[PDB]
Amino acid sequence: PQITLWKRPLVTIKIGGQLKEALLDTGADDTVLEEMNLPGRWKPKMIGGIGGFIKVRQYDQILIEICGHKAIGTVLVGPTPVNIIGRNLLTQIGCTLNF
Amino acid sequence: PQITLWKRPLVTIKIGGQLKEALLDTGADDTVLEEMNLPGRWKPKMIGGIGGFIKVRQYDQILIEICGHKAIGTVLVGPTPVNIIGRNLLTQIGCTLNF
Numbered sequence: 577p578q579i580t581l582w583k584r585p586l587v588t589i590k591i592g593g594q595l596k597e598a599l600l601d602t603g604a605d606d607t608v609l610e611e612m613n614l615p616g617r618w619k620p621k622m623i624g625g626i627g628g629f630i631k632v633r634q635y636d637q638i639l640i641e642i643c644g645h646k647a648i649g650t651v652l653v654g655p656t657p658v659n660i661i662g663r664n665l666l667t668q669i670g671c672t673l674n675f
Numbered sequence: 676p677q678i679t680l681w682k683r684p685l686v687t688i689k690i691g692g693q694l695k696e697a698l699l700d701t702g703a704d705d706t707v708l709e710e711m712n713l714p715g716r717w718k719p720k721m722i723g724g725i726g727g728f729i730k731v732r733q734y735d736q737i738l739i740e741i742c743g744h745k746a747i748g749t750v751l752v753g754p755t756p757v758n759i760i761g762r763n764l765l766t767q768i769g770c771t772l773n774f
């Protein structure tokens with residue numbers, strides 16, 4: 577589809593058998609999701625933006641479905657205020673900026 | 676143009692007569708630029724990011740050119756890790772997400 581930017585680009589995603597709302601964020605290098613209890617191994621990581629850094633858990637090869645489009649890659653989990661779909665997965669669903 | 680997301684969507688902007696690199700950031704409601712001198716009045720404001728809140732100077736009705744496209748709107752200036760172009764300006768240049 578085509579998503580205008582009048583409002584926040586929030587879409588429904590599916591991860592770990594759960595449905596969530598997430599932001600399609602071209603400004604985010606990597607996907608970061610609100611705290612959740614994913615199974616599997618993970619590695620600690622810190623990501624920075626406006627306001628400083630937060631500590632997150634980096635899971636690899638996580639399957640995410642974004643508006644019916646399937647994607648698999650790195651998913652960070654931590655105390656982010658919003659679920660954020662980053663470029664690492666936006667590329668896998670064929671997402672582009674157009675103006 | 677059509678911008679893919681394998682790399683950061685960085686573009687050259689023109690503001691206050693100066694050229695700069697900025698990130699097209701669909702996850703940002705507002706436009707936040709690194710420290711710089713801008714003409715015109717400004718009020719103190721606060722914005723929150725993934726890591727907390729920062730102090731910024733709010734400039735209203737600022738002309739800014741993004742890849743040749745002209746926009747006039749609010750520009751926040753403060754200690755952001757990177758110049759980000761938010762939806763308040765992305766809408767003015769007719770920017771959309773497409774997948």
Ligand SMILES: CC(C)CN(C[C@@H](O)[C@H](Cc1ccccc1)NC(=O)O[C@H]1CO[C@H]2OCC[C@H]21)S(=O)(=O)c1ccc(N)cc1
Nearest residue numbers: 601603604605606623624625626702703704705723724725
């Ligand atoms: C600052 C950017 C270069 C990077 N950020 C993505 C960005 O889209 C955030 C993503 C974001 C969105 C909402 C809340 C927190 C973070 N938006 C943001 O900070 O916007 C602020 C300015 O306009 C306002 O609108 C939202 C917050 C304000 S980030 O959240 O810090 C981030 C950094 C690294 C990763 N892997 C994932 C996300």
